[PDB]
Amino acid sequence: AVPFVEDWDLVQTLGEGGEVQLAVNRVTEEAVAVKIVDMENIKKEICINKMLNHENVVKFYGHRREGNIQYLFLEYCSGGELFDRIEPDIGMPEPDAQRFFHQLMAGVVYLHGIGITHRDIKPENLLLDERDNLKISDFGLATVFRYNNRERLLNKMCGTLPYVAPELLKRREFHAEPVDVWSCGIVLTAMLAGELPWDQPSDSCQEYSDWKEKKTYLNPWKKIDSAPLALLHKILVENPSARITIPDIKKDRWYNKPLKKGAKRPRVTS
Ligand SMILES: N#Cc1cnc(NC(=O)Nc2cc3ccccc3cn2)cn1
């Protein structure tokens, strides 16, 4: 009934690869992210996005089609990507990484609970709102791995090589959930060391061979404290059947270690 409420001005480019624009409502000044896709690929991304509703998953508000162009109305996260909070070769303070890792697990538990695998978890796909709350973004490579309580094994090779689990390079078929668990472990490694451990997880990769031989005196492992390193030892396990599951990540000692204070709240003295 209110005129002009459906009008959004595109005020700035947020990302590319089509593009993601910052859209501001003409009347309310509400900020959303509009993903512009110049076209089955986007049809599956829209259908998976309509299933999503969680505080650590980028919100989907709706979609509009202007002939050949698809417009996806998605949550605006003013904090940007987790990628730009990682200082090269340093990482970030361990309590900040623990808090981001808690929020990443909550989002992944949610997705896996409704039978969705993201398949491309990496810091470029983890967005931060104004309060630094993590949001899993971009369901362009996501798929349903469980339907009618029946698990379907995956075979499609996808994701990003430094974050992919070794079974995707070695086996024809693999379970979906240990693959996302592995990529979260590489995110945790990146957050605590500011560097990726290997180009890809194969025996032909020397840094990967060094990890399987427990050469933790080498980088990036030498920069990581023993408590989060003991967790990484459980996540970055070559055999996906022996790899730690999320319920067991939730019982890990470092995972449950008190490290971070709540957000700074205004206070006065006397
Ligand atoms: N796919 C997808 C997607 C991409 N971006 C979404 N939302 C954002 O607010 N993105 C965003 C916000 C940024 C804010 C500051 C700097 C860089 C930024 C990069 N990207 C939502 N979904």
Short mmCIF file of C-alpha atoms and ligand atoms in Angstrom, two decimals:
data_model
loop_
_atom_site.label_atom_id
_atom_site.label_comp_id
_atom_site.label_asym_id
_atom_site.label_seq_id
_atom_site.Cartn_x
_atom_site.Cartn_y
_atom_site.Cartn_z
CA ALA A 1 0.00 0.00 0.00
CA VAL A 2 3.00 2.36 0.74
CA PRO A 3 4.31 3.75 -2.61
CA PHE A 4 8.00 3.13 -3.59
CA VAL A 5 8.70 0.39 -0.84
CA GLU A 6 9.60 -2.12 -3.57
CA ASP A 7 12.30 0.21 -4.98
CA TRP A 8 15.95 -0.61 -4.21
CA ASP A 9 18.92 1.52 -5.29
CA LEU A 10 22.15 -0.38 -6.12
CA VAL A 11 24.78 1.77 -4.39
CA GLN A 12 28.00 -0.38 -4.49
CA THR A 13 29.67 -3.60 -5.73
CA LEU A 14 30.32 -6.06 -2.87
CA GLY A 15 31.76 -8.98 -4.86
CA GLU A 16 32.17 -10.37 -8.40
CA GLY A 17 32.75 -13.66 -10.30
CA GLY A 18 28.06 -12.14 -12.12
CA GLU A 19 28.18 -9.64 -9.22
CA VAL A 20 26.82 -8.85 -5.73
CA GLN A 21 25.51 -5.32 -5.17
CA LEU A 22 24.64 -3.47 -1.98
CA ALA A 23 20.92 -2.57 -2.37
CA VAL A 24 19.30 0.15 -0.23
CA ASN A 25 15.48 0.49 -0.01
CA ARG A 26 14.23 3.87 -1.36
CA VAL A 27 11.71 4.26 1.50
CA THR A 28 13.03 2.36 4.57
CA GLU A 29 16.82 2.50 3.80
CA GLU A 30 16.99 -1.24 4.71
CA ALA A 31 20.25 -2.73 3.28
CA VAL A 32 20.27 -6.08 1.48
CA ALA A 33 22.74 -7.87 -0.84
CA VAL A 34 21.47 -8.41 -4.40
CA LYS A 35 23.20 -11.23 -6.32
CA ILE A 36 22.90 -10.55 -10.08
CA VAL A 37 23.15 -13.75 -12.21
CA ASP A 38 23.19 -13.30 -16.04
CA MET A 39 22.02 -16.75 -17.27
CA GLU A 40 19.58 -25.24 -13.55
CA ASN A 41 22.60 -23.79 -11.65
CA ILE A 42 20.83 -20.72 -10.19
CA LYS A 43 17.49 -22.73 -10.03
CA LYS A 44 19.11 -25.16 -7.51
CA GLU A 45 20.72 -22.23 -5.52
CA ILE A 46 17.25 -20.55 -5.17
CA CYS A 47 15.56 -23.88 -4.20
CA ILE A 48 18.23 -24.57 -1.54
CA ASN A 49 18.13 -20.90 -0.30
CA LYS A 50 14.29 -21.19 0.30
CA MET A 51 15.03 -24.06 2.77
CA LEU A 52 17.41 -21.89 4.88
CA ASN A 53 16.56 -20.20 8.15
CA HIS A 54 19.35 -19.89 10.75
CA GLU A 55 21.27 -17.05 12.52
CA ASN A 56 24.64 -18.33 11.08
CA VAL A 57 23.39 -18.84 7.50
CA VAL A 58 22.93 -15.88 5.08
CA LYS A 59 19.16 -15.10 4.88
CA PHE A 60 17.24 -15.39 1.65
CA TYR A 61 14.49 -12.77 1.19
CA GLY A 62 13.32 -13.72 -2.33
CA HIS A 63 14.21 -13.66 -6.03
CA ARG A 64 13.16 -11.65 -9.12
CA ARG A 65 13.67 -12.46 -12.83
CA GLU A 66 14.05 -9.67 -15.45
CA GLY A 67 13.98 -11.82 -18.60
CA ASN A 68 17.49 -13.35 -18.76
CA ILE A 69 18.79 -11.84 -15.45
CA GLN A 70 18.13 -13.46 -12.01
CA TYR A 71 18.14 -11.21 -8.89
CA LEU A 72 18.72 -12.92 -5.52
CA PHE A 73 17.80 -10.82 -2.43
CA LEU A 74 20.21 -11.92 0.30
CA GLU A 75 21.28 -10.79 3.77
CA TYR A 76 23.70 -7.81 3.86
CA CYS A 77 26.68 -8.51 6.16
CA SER A 78 28.46 -5.13 6.72
CA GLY A 79 31.49 -6.87 8.40
CA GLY A 80 32.54 -8.34 5.05
CA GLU A 81 34.34 -11.65 4.61
CA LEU A 82 36.11 -13.64 7.38
CA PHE A 83 39.01 -13.72 4.84
CA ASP A 84 39.87 -10.02 5.58
CA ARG A 85 40.03 -10.61 9.38
CA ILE A 86 42.85 -13.11 8.83
CA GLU A 87 46.25 -11.40 8.94
CA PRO A 88 48.66 -13.05 6.41
CA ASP A 89 51.12 -15.45 8.18
CA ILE A 90 49.68 -14.41 11.65
CA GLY A 91 45.94 -15.26 11.73
CA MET A 92 43.89 -13.61 14.50
CA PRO A 93 43.65 -13.84 18.36
CA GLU A 94 42.79 -17.41 19.41
CA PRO A 95 39.54 -16.37 21.35
CA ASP A 96 38.21 -14.60 18.17
CA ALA A 97 38.94 -17.73 16.05
CA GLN A 98 37.26 -19.95 18.76
CA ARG A 99 34.13 -17.73 18.68
CA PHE A 100 34.09 -17.76 14.82
CA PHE A 101 34.62 -21.57 14.86
CA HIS A 102 31.66 -21.98 17.36
CA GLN A 103 29.37 -20.02 15.00
CA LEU A 104 30.64 -21.93 11.94
CA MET A 105 29.79 -25.29 13.68
CA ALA A 106 26.26 -24.02 14.56
CA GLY A 107 25.67 -23.10 10.89
CA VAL A 108 27.10 -26.42 9.53
CA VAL A 109 25.13 -28.49 12.20
CA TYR A 110 22.02 -26.68 10.95
CA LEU A 111 22.72 -27.32 7.24
CA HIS A 112 23.61 -31.01 7.86
CA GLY A 113 20.48 -31.39 10.08
CA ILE A 114 18.24 -30.37 7.15
CA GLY A 115 20.37 -32.54 4.78
CA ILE A 116 22.30 -29.79 2.97
CA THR A 117 26.08 -29.82 2.30
CA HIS A 118 27.65 -26.43 1.37
CA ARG A 119 30.67 -28.14 -0.43
CA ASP A 120 32.73 -24.84 -0.60
CA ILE A 121 33.42 -23.69 3.00
CA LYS A 122 36.28 -21.17 3.01
CA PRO A 123 36.85 -17.68 4.59
CA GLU A 124 35.66 -15.92 1.36
CA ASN A 125 32.24 -17.62 1.94
CA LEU A 126 31.94 -16.77 5.63
CA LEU A 127 30.48 -13.30 6.12
CA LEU A 128 30.30 -11.11 9.19
CA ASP A 129 27.41 -8.84 10.28
CA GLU A 130 27.85 -5.50 12.24
CA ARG A 131 28.31 -7.51 15.54
CA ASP A 132 30.91 -9.91 13.93
CA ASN A 133 28.36 -12.81 13.82
CA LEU A 134 29.44 -15.34 11.22
CA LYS A 135 27.09 -16.23 8.32
CA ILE A 136 27.65 -19.09 5.85
CA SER A 137 27.18 -17.67 2.31
CA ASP A 138 26.86 -18.76 -1.36
CA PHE A 139 24.88 -21.99 -1.93
CA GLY A 140 25.90 -22.12 -5.61
CA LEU A 141 27.76 -25.48 -5.08
CA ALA A 142 25.46 -26.76 -2.29
CA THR A 143 23.36 -29.95 -2.69
CA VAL A 144 20.88 -32.17 -0.78
CA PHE A 145 22.79 -35.20 0.55
CA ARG A 146 19.86 -36.57 2.64
CA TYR A 147 16.26 -36.90 1.48
CA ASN A 148 13.41 -38.95 3.06
CA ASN A 149 15.99 -39.96 5.74
CA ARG A 150 18.11 -41.69 3.02
CA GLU A 151 21.71 -40.53 2.62
CA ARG A 152 23.07 -40.23 -0.91
CA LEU A 153 26.82 -40.59 -1.45
CA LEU A 154 28.46 -37.86 -3.46
CA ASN A 155 30.85 -38.20 -6.42
CA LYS A 156 31.00 -34.65 -7.90
CA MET A 157 34.44 -33.08 -7.53
CA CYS A 158 33.92 -29.51 -6.36
CA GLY A 159 35.00 -26.90 -3.85
CA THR A 160 38.42 -25.16 -3.65
CA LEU A 161 41.61 -27.30 -3.72
CA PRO A 162 43.35 -26.00 -0.45
CA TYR A 163 40.05 -26.69 1.46
CA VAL A 164 38.94 -29.99 -0.17
CA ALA A 165 39.02 -33.28 1.77
CA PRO A 166 41.52 -35.94 0.43
CA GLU A 167 38.70 -38.52 -0.32
CA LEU A 168 37.38 -36.18 -3.12
CA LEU A 169 40.78 -36.64 -4.86
CA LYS A 170 41.20 -40.38 -4.04
CA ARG A 171 37.77 -42.03 -4.05
CA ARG A 172 34.96 -42.24 -6.61
CA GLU A 173 32.26 -41.83 -3.87
CA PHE A 174 32.31 -40.20 -0.44
CA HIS A 175 30.04 -39.15 2.43
CA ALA A 176 29.02 -35.44 2.30
CA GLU A 177 29.38 -34.45 6.04
CA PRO A 178 33.13 -35.32 6.61
CA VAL A 179 33.95 -33.18 3.54
CA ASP A 180 32.46 -29.97 5.19
CA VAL A 181 34.11 -30.96 8.55
CA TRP A 182 37.54 -31.07 6.73
CA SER A 183 37.06 -27.61 5.10
CA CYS A 184 36.08 -26.14 8.58
CA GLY A 185 39.42 -27.55 9.89
CA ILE A 186 41.31 -25.72 7.09
CA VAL A 187 39.35 -22.52 7.98
CA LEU A 188 40.39 -23.01 11.64
CA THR A 189 44.04 -23.57 10.51
CA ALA A 190 43.87 -20.29 8.42
CA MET A 191 42.36 -18.30 11.35
CA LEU A 192 45.12 -19.45 13.78
CA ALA A 193 48.16 -19.25 11.46
CA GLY A 194 47.24 -16.80 8.63
CA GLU A 195 48.34 -19.39 6.04
CA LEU A 196 46.96 -22.48 4.27
CA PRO A 197 48.79 -25.76 5.06
CA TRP A 198 48.96 -27.22 1.47
CA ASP A 199 47.97 -26.50 -2.20
CA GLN A 200 45.82 -29.70 -2.08
CA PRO A 201 45.62 -32.81 0.28
CA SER A 202 47.60 -35.38 -1.80
CA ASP A 203 50.75 -37.52 -1.11
CA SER A 204 52.42 -35.69 -4.08
CA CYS A 205 52.07 -32.54 -1.87
CA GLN A 206 55.12 -32.40 0.52
CA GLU A 207 53.33 -30.18 3.14
CA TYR A 208 50.48 -32.73 3.25
CA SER A 209 52.97 -35.66 3.64
CA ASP A 210 54.70 -33.73 6.50
CA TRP A 211 51.33 -33.40 8.38
CA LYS A 212 50.57 -37.18 8.07
CA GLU A 213 54.14 -37.80 9.45
CA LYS A 214 53.23 -35.42 12.40
CA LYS A 215 55.99 -32.84 11.63
CA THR A 216 54.17 -30.18 13.73
CA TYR A 217 57.50 -28.26 14.36
CA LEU A 218 56.93 -26.90 10.79
CA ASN A 219 54.60 -24.05 9.68
CA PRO A 220 51.58 -23.54 10.00
CA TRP A 221 51.34 -25.98 12.98
CA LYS A 222 54.25 -24.41 14.98
CA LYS A 223 52.22 -21.14 15.31
CA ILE A 224 49.18 -22.97 16.77
CA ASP A 225 48.80 -23.71 20.52
CA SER A 226 48.67 -27.43 21.50
CA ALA A 227 44.94 -27.35 22.63
CA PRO A 228 43.52 -26.15 19.19
CA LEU A 229 46.28 -28.21 17.46
CA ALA A 230 44.97 -31.44 19.20
CA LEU A 231 41.52 -30.56 17.65
CA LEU A 232 43.11 -30.02 14.17
CA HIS A 233 44.80 -33.48 14.63
CA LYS A 234 41.26 -34.95 14.95
CA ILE A 235 39.71 -32.98 12.03
CA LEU A 236 42.50 -33.28 9.45
CA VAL A 237 42.39 -37.12 9.44
CA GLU A 238 42.85 -38.62 5.92
CA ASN A 239 40.29 -41.46 6.44
CA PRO A 240 36.83 -39.74 6.51
CA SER A 241 35.32 -42.72 8.46
CA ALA A 242 37.89 -42.10 11.29
CA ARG A 243 37.60 -38.25 11.09
CA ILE A 244 35.95 -36.53 14.08
CA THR A 245 32.21 -35.76 13.67
CA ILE A 246 30.63 -32.45 14.68
CA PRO A 247 28.97 -33.93 17.90
CA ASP A 248 32.51 -34.97 18.96
CA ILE A 249 34.01 -31.55 17.87
CA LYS A 250 31.46 -30.07 20.41
CA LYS A 251 33.05 -32.21 23.21
CA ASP A 252 36.66 -31.18 22.30
CA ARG A 253 38.70 -29.59 25.14
CA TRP A 254 39.82 -26.45 23.20
CA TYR A 255 36.27 -26.10 21.77
CA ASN A 256 34.96 -25.88 25.36
CA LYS A 257 37.88 -23.82 26.77
CA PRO A 258 36.85 -20.41 28.21
CA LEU A 259 38.88 -17.84 26.23
CA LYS A 260 36.71 -14.93 25.04
CA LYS A 261 34.84 -12.23 26.93
CA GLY A 262 31.42 -11.14 25.66
CA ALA A 263 31.10 -7.95 23.55
CA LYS A 264 32.24 -4.74 25.36
CA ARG A 265 29.06 -3.29 27.00
CA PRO A 266 28.81 0.43 28.12
CA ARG A 267 29.64 0.97 31.83
CA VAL A 268 30.42 3.85 34.28
CA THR A 269 32.13 3.98 37.73
CA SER A 270 31.34 5.48 41.23
N1 LIG B 1 26.24 -15.78 -2.68
C1 LIG B 1 26.24 -14.90 -1.94
C2 LIG B 1 26.20 -13.80 -1.04
C3 LIG B 1 27.21 -12.80 -1.09
N2 LIG B 1 27.15 -11.74 -0.27
C4 LIG B 1 26.11 -11.65 0.57
N3 LIG B 1 26.05 -10.54 1.43
C5 LIG B 1 26.92 -9.53 1.72
O1 LIG B 1 26.63 -8.62 2.49
N4 LIG B 1 28.14 -9.64 1.09
C6 LIG B 1 29.27 -8.82 1.24
C7 LIG B 1 29.35 -7.68 2.11
C8 LIG B 1 30.60 -7.00 2.19
C9 LIG B 1 30.79 -5.88 3.03
C10 LIG B 1 32.01 -5.24 3.08
C11 LIG B 1 33.06 -5.67 2.30
C12 LIG B 1 32.91 -6.75 1.47
C13 LIG B 1 31.68 -7.45 1.40
C14 LIG B 1 31.49 -8.60 0.59
N5 LIG B 1 30.33 -9.23 0.53
C15 LIG B 1 25.10 -12.63 0.59
N6 LIG B 1 25.16 -13.71 -0.19
#
